[PDB]
Every structure is written in C-alpha cells, then in structure tokens.
Amino acid sequence: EVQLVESGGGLVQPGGSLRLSCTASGFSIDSYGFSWVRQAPGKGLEHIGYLTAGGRAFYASWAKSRSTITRNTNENTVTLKMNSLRAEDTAVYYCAKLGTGSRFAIWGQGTLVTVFNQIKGPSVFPLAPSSKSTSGGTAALGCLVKDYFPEPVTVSWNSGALTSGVHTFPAVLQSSGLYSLSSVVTVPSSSLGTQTYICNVNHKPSNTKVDKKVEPKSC
Amino acid sequence: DIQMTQSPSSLSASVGDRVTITCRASQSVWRNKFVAWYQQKPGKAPKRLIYAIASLYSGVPSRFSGSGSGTDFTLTISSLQPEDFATYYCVGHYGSENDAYYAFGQGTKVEIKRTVAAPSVFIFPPSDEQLKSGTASVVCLLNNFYPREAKVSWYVDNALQSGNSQESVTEQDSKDSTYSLSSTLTLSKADYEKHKVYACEVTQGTTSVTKSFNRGEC
Ligand SMILES: [Cl-]
Ligand SMILES: [Cl-]
C-alpha cells in the first residue's frame, strides 16, 4: 500500500539536466517531509536536499546552485530537477523519508541517471575452458566483455538457468577510457562435451545484446 | 552545515565477534537524538536498522543496538553473523526554525573473517577472434579464496610485466565468504605473437602457484 516510486531516470549528456519524480501511494505527499538521496556506483550515500512537510526546500550546499525540489499535491509527487550535469552526477537517485528520529521511514526503489560523454557497445570474447580441465573435476570458463561505455553491462548464463558458481566481476576502467569486465563460471569438466554454455551480455546504453556460446577450443 | 564522521571505514571480524561502529556529528543533531543507522548489502537498497539513536525497528535482530550521548553515536553488533556482511551508514538530522539538513556518514564496510583458503587458479589465452582486432587479452582467475590480499604477477617469456595489467575483485561471497579475483594482461597482437610462454604467478603468504600456456599449443 504505502509506496514511493521514482521515475525519470535515463542517460543524460554532460551539461544536460535530470528531472526525477517520486510518486507516493497510500498517503498524501504533503503530510511528510521527503529527501532526495543519491549513490554513485560503488560509492556511499549523499543527501541532496529535503522538502519539509510545510513545503520548504533545503539543499546540501553543493546542490543548491543547480537543484530544485518541488511538490505537486494534485499528483501526489515530489520532484528533483538538477541541471548542468557532469559525470560525477551519475548515480542511483532515491526519494526517501529517512526516519532519523521517527518510526515512519520509506524509500523508493531508486532510479539510475547516467551522465555519458560517449556510447559504445561491448565486444565479447570467450574465456574457453582449459584443455587441462580435470576429468571428473571442475572447469572454469567465461566471457570477456571489453571496450564498452557507459556502465553498466549485465551478464547471465544460459538465459538465467545457470547461476551456481558464476562470478561476474566489477568492471574496470581501462586507460582507453572504456570499461571491460569478465564473467566466469565453474562447471563439471564432464559437462564440457554435453552442456551448452552461453553468456548473455546486455548493454542497455547502446541497445546491444550479445549471446556467445563458450566451448572448448579445437586442438 | 551538518556532517557525520564515521569510523572505521572498514573492518573485518570473525563470526560471533562484537563489532563497534561510531559516528560523530559535527554539531548537535535535532533534539540530540535524530540519528539512524542503515545497512546496505551488495546490489540492494539501504535498509534502516535503528532510529532515534537506539530504537530497533521491528523485525531487526536484537544483536544490533544503537547508543549515543553528546554528539557521538555508536552502532554495536554483539555477535556478528554471516548475513551481516554489508556497508553500514549513520544518518543524522540537523534542524532549526530555518534549517532542515541531513548528512550520511561515509559508510563502514564490514567483512567476515574466515579460515584462509587457497584459490583455484585458471589462465585463459586470448581468443583468435580478439586477435583480429589488433589486441590480445590474457586473463588469470583466482577463484573462491581468502584473504583478499594476493600478489598476481605476469610473465611473458619469463619477463616480469609491469603496467599492462588490471585487477578486479568480487564482493565477499554469501555461501563461503570467499573472494574471486581476475587479472587481465593487455598486449598488442604484435607483442603477443612475438612471445611464446605466458604465465600468471599467484602468491599468497609462503606459496606461489603459476599457471601458464604456450601460444599455439593445445
Ligand atoms: Cl520533533
Ligand atoms: Cl550526505
């Protein structure tokens, strides 16, 4: 019943603006104060600003020059606008009643905003199971996901049917300015002749999906 | 305005250990008590554990307790459990007639100590397909090990490499509290085809495991 839902996420060019809405259901948005919070990938939480129940907006000093927080009671929303964006503004944006001293606390699910100076779909190469794989033992295989921008890429195996033993590494930023990652899985070596292993790589920023069958390499 | 200064930035503790995390407010928080503690596990949203310094939210395990006095606030985990791997944040509120501000601490990454475990090590040559692009990626995998600290050195025809590799590490596992780590060596096609023996040398403590291949050989 009680819920907050962020909308408006997406890709923005540097110098662009973001506009996120936070829609409440189960209560009136004007009966409580709400914060906007963000988290850069792999980093901590940052408070942007807070709109009191009375409708007064207070911003972290760094955000005041380019942020606006408003409320619309007819639509039961709170809204964050931020302009003149830079790469450092890439983050998951949440609306929330933080509940620092009251029982009622509620967060939206979060919406990703990515500030991108470039778009580039990934190249995907097999990490082939070793020919030295131990019979009746365990083999490693995977996919190398190279030279894409911006983050993120998602990787499944066999369309989600293979999850046990999978490690998809966090991406590294190469000296080229492009990201690269690998996703690996360990499987029974006795399966290598019989079981098909396909990595499914998805890069929404470039609307690119790659499915790559990874097989033992030919001698 | 208000800041929350959190320490330590990270800690490792054995299951059943008592863990203490502190947060110092840069000035008095609202009514001296508007401080909450949040927990965030990998890939999920922050979850509130404790509010008003010490009020444990319903359904939060009682091994989490909050205390505070003055401008110092403390999160205590009395018997660290495996499911407590997370980053913990304090968040404080400052208020006046013309002020309403919030500040998060930097976060404390809590990792679970476990018994040392040696990695399964794998080396992967570059694919023929990639080589057509002019570049070769050689990948070395250290699977399911502990602790995270490892030295991974690349050798090309017995020559130690420097400056042409990058590492990545997984977050601590939920099943075995291990890590996995990749090291990726990047060479031009020209250089890759100029050499024969490729080796990844993994050192932890007193032991080095080296996995290698000869270019072209099966
Ligand atoms: Cl109050
Ligand atoms: Cl903050």
| Contact assignment for A142 to B141 by CB distance below 8 Å | yes
A vs B, Cβ pairs < 8 A, gives 146
CA A75 to centroid of ligand 2, rounded, Å: 28
Shortest distance, CA A153 to any CA of chain B (angstroms): 14
Q: Pick from B51, B89, B102: which is nearest to A50 by CB?
A: B102
| Contact assignment for A33 to B100 by CB distance below 8 Å | yes
Residues B108 and B128 in one domain: no
For tokens 């002020």, name the residue: B99
Q: At B194, list the tokens.
A: 């100029």
Q: At A211, list the tokens.
A: 């499915």
SS3 B199: strand
**Chain B contact set for A215 (CB, 8 A):** none
Alpha carbon distance A27, A77 (integer Å): 11
Residue in A closest to B94 by C-alpha: A100
Cis peptide bond upstream of B125, omega within 30: no
SS3 B105: coil
Residues B34 and B107 in one domain: yes
Sheet of B64-69, strand order = B4-7, B19-25, B72-77, B64-69
Q: Residues A39, A41, A42, CA angle at the centre, nearest 5°?
A: 95
Alpha carbon distance A146, A171 (integer Å): 9
Interface with B, mutate which of A36, A37, A98 (most B CBs under 10 A): A98
Q: Which of A168, A163, A140, A157 is closest to A213 using CA atoms? A: A157
Give Cβ neighbours of residue B150 (< 8 Å, ≥ 6 apart): B119, B142, B181, B202, B203, B204
Alpha carbon distance A35, B118 (integer Å): 46
**Contact predicate A87/A80, CB 8 Å:** no
Report the amino acid identity of residue B100. Answer: A
Alpha carbon distance B88, A44 (integer Å): 10
Which residues in A13-137 belong to E strands, given as ranges? 18-25, 34-39, 45-51, 57-59, 67-72, 77-82, 91-97, 106-107, 111-115, 123-127
| Contact assignment for B1 to A60 by CB distance below 8 Å | yes
| Contact assignment for B51 to A140 by CB distance below 8 Å | no
Alpha carbon distance A72, B45 (integer Å): 26
**Chain B contact set for A93 (CB, 8 A):** none
Q: Which residues neighbour ligand 2 (ion) by CB within 5 Å?
A: A 46-47; B 103-104
Q: Which of A44, A94, A49, A40 is closest to A69 using CA atoms? A: A49
SS3 A198: strand
Give Cβ neighbours of residue A113 (< 8 Å, ≥ 6 apart): A9, A10, A12, A18, A20, A85, A89, A90, A91, A92, A93
Q: Which of B6, B3, B13 is closest to B37 using CA atoms? A: B6
**Contact predicate A198/A157, CB 8 Å:** yes
**Contact predicate B109/B42, CB 8 Å:** no
Taking each continuous run of H as one helix and of E as one strand, the counts in chain B are: 2, 19
Q: Which of A85, A52, A86, A84 is closest to A69 using CA atoms? A: A52
Instruction: Give how far Cα B51 sits from Cα of B19, B21, B28, B121, B145, Å.
Output: 18, 15, 16, 45, 37
Instruction: Give how far Cα B110 sits from Cα of A169, B25, B91, Å.
Output: 20, 21, 17
Cβ atoms within 10 Å, residue A169: 23
Give Cβ neighbours of residue B50 (< 8 Å, ≥ 6 apart): B36, B37, B56, B57, B60, B64, B65, B66, B75
**Chain A contact set for B136 (CB, 8 A):** none
Alpha carbon distance B115, A46 (integer Å): 35
Q: Pick from B38, B51, B129: which is nearest to A125 by CB?
A: B129
Residues B198 and B163 in one domain: yes
Tally of domains in chain B: 2
Instruction: Give how far Cα A54 sits from Cα of A70, B84, B101, B134, Å.
Output: 12, 38, 15, 62
Residues B8 and B84 in one domain: yes
| Contact assignment for A100 to B30 by CB distance below 8 Å | yes
**Contact predicate B39/B60, CB 8 Å:** no
Shortest distance, CA A93 to any CA of chain B (angstroms): 11
Ligand closest to CA B31: 1
Per-residue buried b or exposed e for B156-183, using 16+ beta carbons within 10 Å of the residue's own CB:
beeeebeeebeebbbbbbeeebbbbbbb
Give Cβ neighbours of residue B51 (< 8 Å, ≥ 6 apart): A99, A100, A101, A102, A103, A105, B35, B36, B37, B57
For tokens 């929303």, name the residue: A77
Residue in B closest to A57 by C-alpha: B100
Taking each continuous run of H as one helix and of E as one strand, the counts in chain A are: 1, 19
Residues B104 and B130 in one domain: no
**Chain B contact set for A60 (CB, 8 A):** 1, 101
- Indicate the DSSP class of residue A120: B
CATH number assigned to the domain comprising residue B199? 2.60.40.10
CA A97 to centroid of ligand 2, rounded, Å: 14
SS3 B191: helix
Q: Pick from B55, B105, B139: which is nearest to A127 by CB?
A: B139
Shortest distance, CA A24 to any CA of chain B (angstroms): 18
Alpha carbon distance A186, B62 (integer Å): 38
This entry's atomic model was obtained through X-ray
Query: Which fold is adopted by the domain A123-213?
Result: Immunoglobulin-like (2.60.40)
Dihedral sign from CA coordinates of B125, B127, B133, B134:
positive
The alpha helices in chain B, defined as continuous H runs, are: 128-131, 189-193
For tokens 């080796």, name the residue: B199
> What are residue B101's DSSP bridge partners?
B94
Q: Quick one: CATH architecture of A3-115? A: Sandwich (2.60)
**Contact predicate B66/B37, CB 8 Å:** yes
**Structural domain range at position B139:** 120-214
Instruction: Give how far Cα A30 sits from Cα of A4, A25, A26, A55, A78, Å.
Output: 13, 12, 12, 8, 9
Domain boundary among B113, B145, B165: B113
Q: What is the largest CA-CA distance in chain B?
A: 76
For tokens 């907006």, name the residue: A57
Domain boundary among B113, B135, B166: B113
Q: Residues B199, B204, B208, CA angle at the centre, nearest 5°?
A: 40
Q: At A56, list the tokens.
A: 């007064």
What is the distance, to the nearest Å, from the Cα of residue A27 to the centroid of all Cα atoms in its chain? 29
| Contact assignment for A172 to B166 by CB distance below 8 Å | yes
**Contact predicate B95/B34, CB 8 Å:** yes
CA B137 to centroid of ligand 1, rounded, Å: 59
Residues B70 and B137 in one domain: no
Domain boundary among B64, B80, B113: B113
Q: Do the domains A123-213 and A3-115 match in fold?
A: yes
Sequence spans of domains, chain A: 3-115, 123-213
Residues B67 and B138 in one domain: no
> What are residue A6's DSSP bridge partners?
A22
Residues B83 and B160 in one domain: no
| Contact assignment for B51 to A105 by CB distance below 8 Å | yes
For tokens 């999978």, name the residue: A166
Residues B50 and B151 in one domain: no
Q: What backbone phi and psi angles, to 5 degrees, belong to A204?
A: -55, -40
Residues B125 and B151 in one domain: yes
Ligand closest to CA B95: 1
**Chain A contact set for B33 (CB, 8 A):** 101
Ramachandran bin of A103, using left for φ above 0, alpha for ψ from -120 to 50, beta for the remaining angles: alpha
Residues B43 and B98 in one domain: yes
Q: Pick from A45, A61, A174: which is nearest to B1 by CB?
A: A61
| Contact assignment for A180 to B34 by CB distance below 8 Å | no
Cβ atoms within 10 Å, residue B30: 19
